[PDB]
Design a protein around this motif. Structure first.
Motif, PDB file in Angstrom:
ATOM      1  N   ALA G   3      32.869  65.084  35.926  1.00 39.94           N
ATOM      2  CA  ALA G   3      34.314  65.106  35.882  1.00 39.94           C
ATOM      3  C   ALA G   3      34.799  63.788  35.303  1.00 39.94           C
ATOM      4  O   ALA G   3      34.045  62.824  35.198  1.00 39.94           O
ATOM      5  N   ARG G   4      36.054  63.754  34.915  1.00 35.64           N
ATOM      6  CA  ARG G   4      36.553  62.556  34.256  1.00 35.64           C
ATOM      7  C   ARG G   4      36.915  61.515  35.304  1.00 35.64           C
ATOM      8  O   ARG G   4      37.570  61.851  36.291  1.00 35.64           O
ATOM      9  N   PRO G   5      36.496  60.261  35.134  1.00 37.26           N
ATOM     10  CA  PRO G   5      36.870  59.226  36.094  1.00 37.26           C
ATOM     11  C   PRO G   5      38.354  58.936  36.021  1.00 37.26           C
ATOM     12  O   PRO G   5      38.948  58.934  34.945  1.00 37.26           O
ATOM     13  N   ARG G   6      38.954  58.717  37.179  1.00 43.09           N
ATOM     14  CA  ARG G   6      40.375  58.436  37.213  1.00 43.09           C
ATOM     15  C   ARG G   6      40.644  57.033  36.698  1.00 43.09           C
ATOM     16  O   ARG G   6      39.782  56.157  36.741  1.00 43.09           O
ATOM     17  N   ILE G   7      41.844  56.839  36.160  1.00 40.27           N
ATOM     18  CA  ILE G   7      42.253  55.524  35.690  1.00 40.27           C
ATOM     19  C   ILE G   7      42.468  54.636  36.902  1.00 40.27           C
ATOM     20  O   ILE G   7      43.324  54.913  37.748  1.00 40.27           O
ATOM     21  N   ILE G   8      41.686  53.575  36.998  1.00 37.99           N
ATOM     22  CA  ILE G   8      41.735  52.712  38.167  1.00 37.99           C
ATOM     23  C   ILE G   8      42.889  51.741  38.021  1.00 37.99           C
ATOM     24  O   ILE G   8      42.998  51.034  37.014  1.00 37.99           O
ATOM     25  N   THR G   9      43.764  51.725  39.016  1.00 37.36           N
ATOM     26  CA  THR G   9      44.905  50.832  39.005  1.00 37.36           C
ATOM     27  C   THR G   9      44.432  49.401  39.164  1.00 37.36           C
ATOM     28  O   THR G   9      43.656  49.093  40.072  1.00 37.36           O
ATOM     29  N   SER G  10      44.874  48.542  38.252  1.00 35.04           N
ATOM     30  CA  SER G  10      44.460  47.151  38.207  1.00 35.04           C
ATOM     31  C   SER G  10      44.907  46.407  39.450  1.00 35.04           C
ATOM     32  O   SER G  10      46.098  46.147  39.633  1.00 35.04           O
ATOM     33  N   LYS G  11      43.957  46.085  40.316  1.00 35.16           N
ATOM     34  CA  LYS G  11      44.205  45.223  41.458  1.00 35.16           C
ATOM     35  C   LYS G  11      43.678  43.832  41.140  1.00 35.16           C
ATOM     36  O   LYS G  11      42.549  43.686  40.669  1.00 35.16           O
ATOM     37  N   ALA G  12      44.501  42.824  41.385  1.00 34.90           N
ATOM     38  CA  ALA G  12      44.157  41.429  41.163  1.00 34.90           C
ATOM     39  C   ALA G  12      43.448  40.893  42.396  1.00 34.90           C
ATOM     40  O   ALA G  12      43.280  41.645  43.363  1.00 34.90           O
ATOM     41  N   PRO G  13      42.963  39.646  42.397  1.00 35.70           N
ATOM     42  CA  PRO G  13      42.605  39.005  43.667  1.00 35.70           C
ATOM     43  C   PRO G  13      43.787  38.964  44.616  1.00 35.70           C
ATOM     44  O   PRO G  13      44.929  38.777  44.198  1.00 35.70           O
ATOM     45  N   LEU G  14      43.507  39.173  45.900  1.00 35.65           N
ATOM     46  CA  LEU G  14      44.590  39.296  46.863  1.00 35.65           C
ATOM     47  C   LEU G  14      45.234  37.943  47.107  1.00 35.65           C
ATOM     48  O   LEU G  14      44.573  36.904  47.122  1.00 35.65           O
ATOM     49  N   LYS G 392      55.073  48.007  38.440  1.00 34.62           N
ATOM     50  CA  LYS G 392      54.634  46.892  37.611  1.00 34.62           C
ATOM     51  C   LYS G 392      53.123  46.879  37.460  1.00 34.62           C
ATOM     52  O   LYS G 392      52.601  46.612  36.371  1.00 34.62           O
ATOM     53  N   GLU G 393      52.405  47.236  38.522  1.00 37.98           N
ATOM     54  CA  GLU G 393      50.966  47.402  38.405  1.00 37.98           C
ATOM     55  C   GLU G 393      50.598  48.628  37.586  1.00 37.98           C
ATOM     56  O   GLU G 393      49.516  48.659  37.002  1.00 37.98           O
ATOM     57  N   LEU G 394      51.488  49.610  37.471  1.00 39.15           N
ATOM     58  CA  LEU G 394      51.167  50.760  36.639  1.00 39.15           C
ATOM     59  C   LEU G 394      51.340  50.450  35.163  1.00 39.15           C
ATOM     60  O   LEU G 394      50.512  50.869  34.349  1.00 39.15           O
ATOM     61  N   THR G 395      52.391  49.706  34.807  1.00 41.43           N
ATOM     62  CA  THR G 395      52.523  49.216  33.437  1.00 41.43           C
ATOM     63  C   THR G 395      51.376  48.292  33.076  1.00 41.43           C
ATOM     64  O   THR G 395      50.840  48.356  31.963  1.00 41.43           O
ATOM     65  N   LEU G 396      50.969  47.446  34.023  1.00 39.03           N
ATOM     66  CA  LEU G 396      49.839  46.564  33.779  1.00 39.03           C
ATOM     67  C   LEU G 396      48.546  47.344  33.601  1.00 39.03           C
ATOM     68  O   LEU G 396      47.748  47.016  32.721  1.00 39.03           O
ATOM     69  N   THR G 397      48.324  48.392  34.393  1.00 38.63           N
ATOM     70  CA  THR G 397      47.051  49.083  34.260  1.00 38.63           C
ATOM     71  C   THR G 397      46.997  49.954  33.017  1.00 38.63           C
ATOM     72  O   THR G 397      45.917  50.113  32.448  1.00 38.63           O
ATOM     73  N   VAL G 398      48.128  50.447  32.511  1.00 38.88           N
ATOM     74  CA  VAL G 398      48.008  51.185  31.257  1.00 38.88           C
ATOM     75  C   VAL G 398      47.890  50.230  30.068  1.00 38.88           C
ATOM     76  O   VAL G 398      47.172  50.530  29.105  1.00 38.88           O
ATOM     77  N   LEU G 399      48.507  49.040  30.143  1.00 33.98           N
ATOM     78  CA  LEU G 399      48.252  48.010  29.138  1.00 33.98           C
ATOM     79  C   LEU G 399      46.788  47.588  29.130  1.00 33.98           C
ATOM     80  O   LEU G 399      46.178  47.465  28.067  1.00 33.98           O
ATOM     81  N   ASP G 433      54.621  36.428  35.805  1.00 31.14           N
ATOM     82  CA  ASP G 433      53.579  36.639  36.793  1.00 31.14           C
ATOM     83  C   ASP G 433      52.229  36.169  36.277  1.00 31.14           C
ATOM     84  O   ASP G 433      51.960  36.184  35.079  1.00 31.14           O
ATOM     85  N   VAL G 434      51.375  35.756  37.210  1.00 30.73           N
ATOM     86  CA  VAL G 434      50.038  35.293  36.861  1.00 30.73           C
ATOM     87  C   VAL G 434      49.157  36.463  36.457  1.00 30.73           C
ATOM     88  O   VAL G 434      48.367  36.371  35.509  1.00 30.73           O
ATOM     89  N   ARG G 435      49.295  37.588  37.153  1.00 29.63           N
ATOM     90  CA  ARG G 435      48.373  38.699  36.969  1.00 29.63           C
ATOM     91  C   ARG G 435      48.602  39.419  35.653  1.00 29.63           C
ATOM     92  O   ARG G 435      47.674  40.028  35.117  1.00 29.63           O
ATOM     93  N   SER G 436      49.807  39.338  35.103  1.00 28.40           N
ATOM     94  CA  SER G 436      50.114  40.044  33.875  1.00 28.40           C
ATOM     95  C   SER G 436      50.002  39.188  32.628  1.00 28.40           C
ATOM     96  O   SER G 436      49.836  39.745  31.540  1.00 28.40           O
TER      97      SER G 436
END
Lengths: 56, 86, 329, 64, 231, 34, 493, 59
Positions: G3-14, G392-399, G433-436
């Motif tokens: 099956a196709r792997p799901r797009i993993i949402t970009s999580k930064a260091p906590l 904002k994490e969704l825009t970051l993860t598709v970028l 932001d640092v993460r983006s």
RNA sequence: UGCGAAAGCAGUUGAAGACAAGUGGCUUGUCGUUCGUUAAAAUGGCCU
């Protein structure tokens, strides 16, 4: 008291020729197609398509 | 976008092709009906061929080819075929 | 009730012949009782109302004699799949029992007639009938070597018969119902058991006196005795097996069962045993796993406990684990 | 692995086969198996082939 | 004796088929299980029983091929976009057909299928076809072992039912005809041992709401031939 | 490996290790029913 | 095939101060109600048995509120002076209330008109009245007489036991929750006394020296009890007479405590504490009474409680303030012919031999950017990034998926002025932001690499580039001064 | 659609058998039917979940 | 390509033959050709 052996299998090793497209798969099915005869570079493996195990 | 061929007697479908992506505005054929050309708003011209002897003795068109030549649409298509013009 | 209408072992208990119905026609099949030594082809009775009333293993091309209900004894080889020879009497009467000694086949009729056939000659040798024996449904040859004197015939009441005089020489008090098993144990004893009662009795074939009474705790379907009289295993109506160990010794006039075996599945469903076989130290029990396909089990019956419950693995709710897919689908 | 219905030119796909298909062929008498050789070319240092037949019914990897 | 009296059914019994050779009766209904019964006169017992979860069944058929008569498949299907095929082996190996090979829009439910035999007509090689009745006028015929879409036959109207006729030609060659009826009463016959082309189109005299056509007197899908010369 | 052997991997990947009447009826029936 | 792997949402260091499970659970106590009382709410008890009602003791009335409507179902107003304590019996059948005239009056709960008996205790004000938690027919009342009394509610004329010994103002009782002979009482001189009731009873068996004047003593285990008074609370092992924790995480005096066990919570036990400065805090007894969550209220909080362990419905935290008002925060919780035709659809394979299961599980619905990345519509995936309602994490993860996966340039090829302004107008916000900002850096770099002529033509993204320039100027001043702070504490090692 | 709605029509004569099914045949609401290929044997499944079984003695 | 650290540090890019196109040669370009050197594009995208 130490002895060397080769105990575990290797690569499947199909026809490594150029100028043969299509049939480079030298593995066969049986006529009563219940077991699948594939060569390796160390042996002939005979798997069984019903149970997915190697039987010989 | 589908292009269908229907037996006239028995008034019924022989085979359907899912060729274009939108409407098929105009389609035409040659003299001896070895080819059927077709085109519409998705701006490709499809060619359906029956030129093989097996195609003629089995009454089986094949979706032979497809060309992208037009810019926006094709609203009219026609064919001429003579001894020095096809 | 059981789909297996008739069933019998060969001597030594290596194959089982069994007649079951298959969509209104009888079919006769043979299974090996241990695979470590399916058999998917049957003899088919081609008529919807012709059926097997008795069957006997001959002893060497191996064959079955199937006593039918139209006055015929079919003789059917099992390696091939045809009735090799069709013995027939002059009548249409169903035949109630057969037996053989060597090459000499004997059979009883629903008109209480005795017929003798020769398996080596394929001929009806003798036909007779005797007085005051009028509801016969079992015969058993009392063995005296190649001499086939002294038949032993039952009608609810066992009678010993000399065949040279065609007359009755002893009369045993039988039962209150028709005799269903009548088997010779030693050269001086025979066991008998009737339809719908749980009492066997062993008679002395020389005096007429009953030696002992054997008491099952359910109505007896079949019995087998080991070849040296040392053990008798009967199988009952509730699908259980009961072993009388050494019944011919001094629980003095009537003996209970020594061992009792029943089979349950892993669930709690009790499958019934039909038609086991016993020998020296070895006991082979039979049941039906699916609807009509017989499964077997060997047991060292001398070292099991008294109340033994065989466990079988049988599909009850098991998730269909396909071999080409892990458990998560 | 695509299989082209040559009547209507209609593809049926099987998309994520952990290796590029360097050989594919039908196998049975009725064509009930497809046998494939998958070259698995993420490592460039070795030619490591996976042999994968699969039943043509539900397109599941019978005996990889 | 009532055949399913040994093991009761938890739903209305929607389909029912005997085996071509063995004394087996397959029942199946909307309680998404299918049961096989060894039938006889007295004691119709239950051979085996398979409960497909989430898949209520509406048509279930014993298929047995003509080449070796040793396959013994059971094809079963309901109001789903798939159809199961159990391979009889006395665990249970079943496969699922869920790909119309480009034709999923015209087949949204696998309910009304029928299984039949087809000959290659250049070899003398037969294979089973399943035939699915679809939305517009469509019958989608596909292979019973590989599931490949072989051909399709479209009638003009509301397809309501269809049946399979066979006719022998020579020694060892026969021809398969699909007979499909409009709701209105007009019947198409398609020769499908060649490409699925119409050979006859007639009309039922009277008849305005037509639910069920059947043939009989020879080999139907419910009286199947075990040997190709017995067609 | 953790039980006194050493496994090695060949360049063509072979793993090696350095360590420390009735009888004929039965036969013909298993023939004729298979 | 897989099956196709799901797009993993970009999580930064906590980052620090993440949301703990304890504070997520205790933060879903919301929808606060503020009920203005006539005077300061001094005590609040809960019904034990159907643990769904609670009694609030204001001045000269006791109101039972319901735990589903939060309105006063019933009220008790026939007191002569200020009523002080009001608790339910362990069977939840009757309600005792100590009053400022030293008259314990016990009514039955859910019937304010039938006063069942009026124990006339001391002439001093009776400040705490509670039934036994094991026994049913004994009631412990301490008063401003420096002596508690155990009363049998059958013989309500003389107290069956008189626990004296304390030098000043006994304000709290407690019972030990497995030994029913054991009463721990707490007074304003410190000194939690505790008494065995089979003995004389005029002397405690021992005494626990909380140094501050205690305000409450509750029992957590059968062994350990917690006393609050002064700025801290202390916990005491009772089999060894010995203190083992003390938390002083308040500014003013801890007024009350209560305790929860086994309720549906990440916290298996919870002690909450109310402390005269606005704060009520929850402490977890299993990791060393560490504080996990807190509420701040609009005045000094005088008493608090929560719903009991078996609440089974709408769950409550109530805190009554000295300002004279009451704050509740809750967490909430065809034809017979047709059915005979469609009977079997609920069977699920019970008596059936083999049970096959190949219905695949239905996964989560794909978002538009994920299905466009699946369909290889990469410019449409960028367009689906820059819709307004996107996280904002969704825009970051598709970028990041377009960056790792294929080509920034492919995603940016066919653009012009009107279709780049979403990207750059988001890059203004993402450059902070640092993460983006790494992804924002290379996306802005590529778009000015391949749209340097549209820079010349359109003036209305020139100004967007200038605003981006001042943004990177602010951010580079920040990233320089962070390195200066990093050096200036590297100096202090 | 209704209860006990099953008929066996003999053919070529195209005439319904008049002695079966009677008013006391437990046919039910006949929702499936099947013929045996060899035994001459009807199975009739109704909406209650019961396959009833009959044997035609001509076969 | 070599040495490297993830930075970088040294080295480049010849010859033969055949064929194609253009104008027997000449020019240009290729090579399922060899020797030597450590040495972007055919409307064509992912299943139920």
């Amino acid at each position: 008291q130490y002895k060397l052996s080769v105990v575990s299998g290797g690569k499947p090793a199909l026809n490594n020729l150029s100028s043969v497209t299509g049939n480079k798969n030298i593995a066969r099915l049986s006529q009563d197609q219940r077991n699948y005869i594939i060569p390796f570079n160390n042996q002939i493996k005979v798997y069984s398509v019903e149970t997915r195990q190697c039987v010989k | 976008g589908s292009i269908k061929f229907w037996d006239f007697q028995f008034a019924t479908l022989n085979q359907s092709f899912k060729a274009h992506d939108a409407d098929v505005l105009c389609l035409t054929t040659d003299t001896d009906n070895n080819y059927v050309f077709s085109a519409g708003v998705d701006r490709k011209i499809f060619q359906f061929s029956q030129n093989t002897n097996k195609s003629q003795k089995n009454n089986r068109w094949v979706n032979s080819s497809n060309r992208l030549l037009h810019g926006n649409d094709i609203r009219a298509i026609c064919a001429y075929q003579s001894k020095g013009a096809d | 009730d059981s789909p297996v209408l008739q069933s019998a072992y060969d001597p030594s208990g290596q194959y089982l012949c069994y007649v079951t119905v298959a969509l209104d026609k009888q079919r006769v099949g043979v299974q090996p009782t241990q695979r470590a030594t399916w058999n998917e082809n049957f003899l088919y009775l081609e008529d919807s109302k012709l059926k097997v009333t008795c069957l006997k293993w001959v002893n060497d091309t191996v064959a079955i004699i199937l006593g039918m209900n139209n006055g015929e004894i079919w003789l059917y080889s099992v390696l091939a799949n045809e009735v090799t020879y069709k013995f027939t009497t002059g009548n249409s009467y169903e035949i109630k029992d057969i037996d053989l000694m060597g090459n000499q086949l004997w059979c009883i009729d629903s008109s209480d007639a005795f017929y003798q056939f020769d398996l080596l000659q394929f001929k009806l040798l003798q036909h007779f009938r005797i007085n005051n024996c009028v509801q016969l449904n079992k015969l058993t040859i009392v063995p005296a070597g190649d001499s086939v004197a002294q038949l032993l015939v039952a009608s609810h009441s066992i009678s010993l018969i000399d065949i040279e005089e065609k007359k009755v020489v002893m009369t045993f008090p039988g039962h209150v119902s028709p005799v269903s098993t009548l088997q010779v144990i030693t050269n001086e004893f025979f066991i008998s058991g009737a339809e719908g009662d749980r009492f066997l009795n062993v008679y002395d074939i020389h005096s007429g006196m009953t030696k002992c009474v054997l008491v099952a705790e359910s109505d007896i379907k079949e019995l087998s005795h080991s070849g040296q009289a040392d053990s008798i295993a009967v199988t009952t109506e509730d699908g259980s097996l009961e072993i009388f160990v050494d019944p011919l010794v001094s629980g003095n006039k009537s003996k209970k069962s020594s061992k009792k075996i029943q089979i349950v599945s892993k669930d709690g469903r009790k499958v019934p045993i039909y038609n086991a076989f016993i020998n020296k130290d070895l006991l082979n029990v039979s049941w039906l796993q699916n609807a009509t396909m017989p499964y077997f089990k060997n047991l060292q019956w001398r070292e099991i406990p008294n109340e033994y419950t065989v466990e079988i693995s049988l599909n009850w709710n098991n998730k269909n684990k396909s071999a080409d897919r892990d458990l998560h689908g | 692995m695509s299989l082209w219905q040559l009547e209507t030119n209609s593809q049926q796909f099987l998309p994520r086969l952990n290796g590029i298909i360097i050989d594919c062929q039908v196998l049975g008498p009725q064509g009930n198996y497809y046998s494939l050789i998958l070259q698995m070319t993420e490592n460039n240092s070795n030619s490591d082939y996976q042999f994968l037949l699969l039943n043509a019914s539900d397109l599941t990897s019978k005996l990889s | 004796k009532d055949a399913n009296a040994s093991h009761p059914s938890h739903s209305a019994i929607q389909s029912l088929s005997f085996h071509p050779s063995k004394p087996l009766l397959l029942t199946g209904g909307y309680d998404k299980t299918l049961r096989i019964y060894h039938i006889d006169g007295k004691t119709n017992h239950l051979v085996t029983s398979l409960h497909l979860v989430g898949s209520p069944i509406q048509t279930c058929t014993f298929y047995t091929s003509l080449s070796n008569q040793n396959q013994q498949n059971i094809f079963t299907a309901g109001r789903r976009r798939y159809m199961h095929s159990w391979d009889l082996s006395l665990t249970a190996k079943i496969e699922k057909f869920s790909r119309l090979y480009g034709h999923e829009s015209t087949q949204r439910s696998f309910e009304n299928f029928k299984v039949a035999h087809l000959q290659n007509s250049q070899t003398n090689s037969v294979h089973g076809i399943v035939l699915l009745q679809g939305n517009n006028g469509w019958i989608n015929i596909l292979h019973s072992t590989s599931g490949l879409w072989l051909m399709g036959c479209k009638i003009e109207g509301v397809i309501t039912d269809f049946c399979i006729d066979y006719q022998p030609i020579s020694r060892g060659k026969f021809r398969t005809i699909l007979i499909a009826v409009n709701a209105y009463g007009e019947v198409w016959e398609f020769d499908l041992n060649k490409n699925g082309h119409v050979i006859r189109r007639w009309k039922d005299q009277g008849g305005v709401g037509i639910t069920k056509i059947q043939v009989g007197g020879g080999t139907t899908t419910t009286c199947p031939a075990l040997q190709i010369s017995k067609i | 490996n953790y039980d006194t052997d050493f496994i090695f991997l060949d360049i063509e990947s072979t793993l090696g290790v350095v360590g420390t009447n009735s009888d004929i009826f039965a036969e013909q029936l298993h023939k004729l029913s298979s | 095939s897989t099956a196709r792997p799901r797009i993993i949402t970009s999580k930064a260091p906590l980052l620090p101060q993440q949301t703990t499970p304890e504070q997520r659970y205790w933060r879903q106590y919301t929808s606060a109600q503020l009920v203005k009382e006539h005077n300061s709410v001094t005590h609040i008890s809960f019904n034990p048995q159907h643990p769904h009602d609670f009694a609030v003791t204001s001045s000269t009335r006791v109101q039972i509120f319901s735990s589903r409507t939060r309105q006063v179902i019933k009220t008790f107003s026939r007191f002569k002076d200020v009523v002080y304590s009001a608790s339910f019996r362990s069977d939840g059948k009757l309600l005792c209330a100590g009053d400022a005239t030293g008259l314990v009056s016990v009514y039955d709960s859910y019937n304010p008109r039938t006063i069942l008996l009026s124990i006339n205790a001391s002439t001093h004000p009776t400040h705490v009245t509670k039934f036994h938690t094991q026994d049913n027919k004994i009631l412990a009342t301490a008063s401003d007489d420096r002596v508690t009394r155990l009363w049998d509610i059958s013989n309500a004329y003389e107290p069956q036991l008189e626990l004296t010994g304390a030098t000043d103002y006994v304000r709290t009782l407690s019972f030990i929750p497995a030994a029913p002979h054991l009463v721990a009482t707490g007074s304003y001189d410190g000194l939690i006394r505790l008494y065995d009731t089979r003995s004389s009873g005029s002397t405690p068996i021992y005494s626990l020296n909380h140094d501050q004047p205690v305000e409450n003593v509750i029992a957590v285990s059968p062994t350990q009890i917690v006393s609050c008074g002064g700025n801290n609370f202390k916990v005491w092992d009772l089999t060894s007479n010995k203190k083992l924790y003390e938390r002083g995480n308040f500014n003013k005096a801890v007024t009350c405590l209560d305790y929860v066990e086994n309720f549906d919570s990440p916290m298996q036990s919870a002690l909450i504490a109310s402390s005269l400065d606005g704060h009520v805090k929850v402490f977890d007894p299993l990791d060393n009474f560490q504080v996990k969550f807190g509420w701040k209220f609009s005045g000094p909080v005088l008493s608090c409680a929560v719903s009991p362990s078996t609440a089974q419905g709408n769950r409550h935290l109530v805190a009554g303030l000295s300002s004279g008002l009451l704050a509740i925060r809750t967490k909430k919780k065809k034809s017979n012919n047709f059915q005979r035709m469609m009977r079997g659809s609920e069977y699920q394979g019970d008596q059936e031999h083999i049970i096959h299961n190949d219905k695949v599980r239905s996964q989560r619905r794909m978002r538009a950017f994920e299905r466009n990345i699946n369909q290889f519509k990469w410019s449409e995936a960028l367009d689906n990034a820059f819709v307004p309602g996107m996280a904002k994490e969704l825009t970051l993860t598709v970028l990041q998926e377009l960056r790792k996966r294929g080509k920034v340039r492919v995603a940016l090829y066919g653009r012009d002025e009107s279709t780049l302004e979403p990207l750059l107008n988001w890059c203004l916000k993402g450059i902070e932001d640092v993460r983006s900002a790494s992804i924002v850096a290379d996306w802005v770099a590529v778009v000015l690499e391949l749209y340097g002529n549209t820079l010349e033509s359109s003036p209305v993204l020139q100004e967007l580039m200038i605003d981006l320039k001042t943004k990177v100027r602010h951010e580079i001043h920040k990233s320089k001064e962070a390195q200066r702070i990093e050096g200036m504490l590297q100096l202090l090692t | 659609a209704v209860k006990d709605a099953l008929r066996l029509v003999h053919l070529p004569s195209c005439s319904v058998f008049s002695n079966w099914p009677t008013s006391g045949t437990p046919l039910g609401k006949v929702t499936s039917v099947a013929f045996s290929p060899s035994g001459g044997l009807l199975a009739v499944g109704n909406e209650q979940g019961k396959v009833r079984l009959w044997k035609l003695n001509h076969y």
